[PDB]
């Protein structure tokens, strides 16, 4: 009854070495994974900065386009008004 | 002792359940990591699309800003010419 236990205990003792080595591999991979993981909030923040730059630029171009068209009309009307007096 | 051995055997059998779940946790985290990693080429593609649109937008804005400045000078100049005749 004692020898019977002694064998199933040494078997389980080796099975803990077998499982600790699996844990030790997965943990080392986990640290390599984490450094890579650090990059993701950085790429996300970069994508946001480029979207905002584009959106601000687009807004500026549209407003600028409106003013130019407005200026052109004023210039044409004024050229016509001036020609009448010269 | 038979009693000492009994405890050590049920504290090795339970320690294998305790180590398998450490393995099962690390493996489940590994799959959640790989899912976050898949986002990397997506954030990179997004940044590139926005970066290109921003650059195309900046060039159109800079051409529009050159024309608007020219019109403004043409307008202030014509205002000066007109004011001379009243």
Interface test with B, best of A33, A35, A59, A83 (most B CBs within 10 A): A33
Q: CA A58 to CA A61: how far, in whole Å? A: 5
Number of domains into which chain A is organized: 1
Distance from CA of A11 to the nearest CA of B (A): 10
- Which of the 8 DSSP states describes residue A1? -
Best probe of the B interface among A56, A59, A68, A80, by most B CBs < 10 A, is: A68
Residue from the list B37, B51, B78 with its beta carbon closest to the beta carbon of A50: B51
Closest CA relative to residue A60, chosen from B15, B1, B82, B60: B60
Resolution of the experimental model, in Å, one decimal: 2.3
Judging contacts by C-beta atoms under 8 Å, the chain B residues touching residue A26 are 23, 26-27, 30
Calpha distance A36→B13 (Å, rounded): 36
Return d(Cα B49, Cα B51) in angstroms, integer.
6
Q: Which domain CATH number covers B68?
A: 1.20.5.990
Answer for the pair A54, B57: CB distance below 8 angstroms, yes or no: yes
- Alpha helices by DSSP H, chain B: 2-10, 13-37, 39-83
Contact list, A2 vs chain B (CB under 8 Å)? 2, 5
Contact predicate A6/B12, CB 8 Å: no
Q: Give the DSSP per-residue string, B59-75.
A: HHHHHHHHHHHHHHHHH
Distance between CA A34 and CA A41 in Å, rounded?
12
Please tell me the distance from the alpha carbon of residue A79 to that of residue A73, in angstroms, as a whole number: 10
Q: Which of A12, A27, A54 sits opposite B12 (nearest CB)?
A: A12
Domain that holds residue B38: 1-86
- Helix A2-83 crosses helix B2-10 at what angle (to 10 degrees)? 20
| Number of other residues whose CB lies within 10 A of the CB of residue A54 | 20
Q: Which among A16, A51, A71 has the least Cβ separation from residue B12?
A: A16
List chain A residues with CB under 8 Å of B19: 16, 19-20, 23
């Amino acid at each position: 009854q004692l020898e019977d236990l002694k064998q199933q205990l040494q078997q389980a003792e080796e099975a803990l070495v077998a499982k600790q080595e699996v844990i030790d591999k997965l943990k080392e991979e986990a640290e390599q994974h984490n450094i890579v993981m650090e990059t993701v909030p950085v790429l996300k923040a970069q994508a946001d900065i480029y979207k905002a730059d584009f959106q601000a630029e687009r807004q500026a171009r549209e407003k600028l386009a409106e003013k130019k068209e407005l200026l052109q009309e004023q210039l044409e009307q004024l050229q016509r008004e001036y020609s009448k007096l010269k």
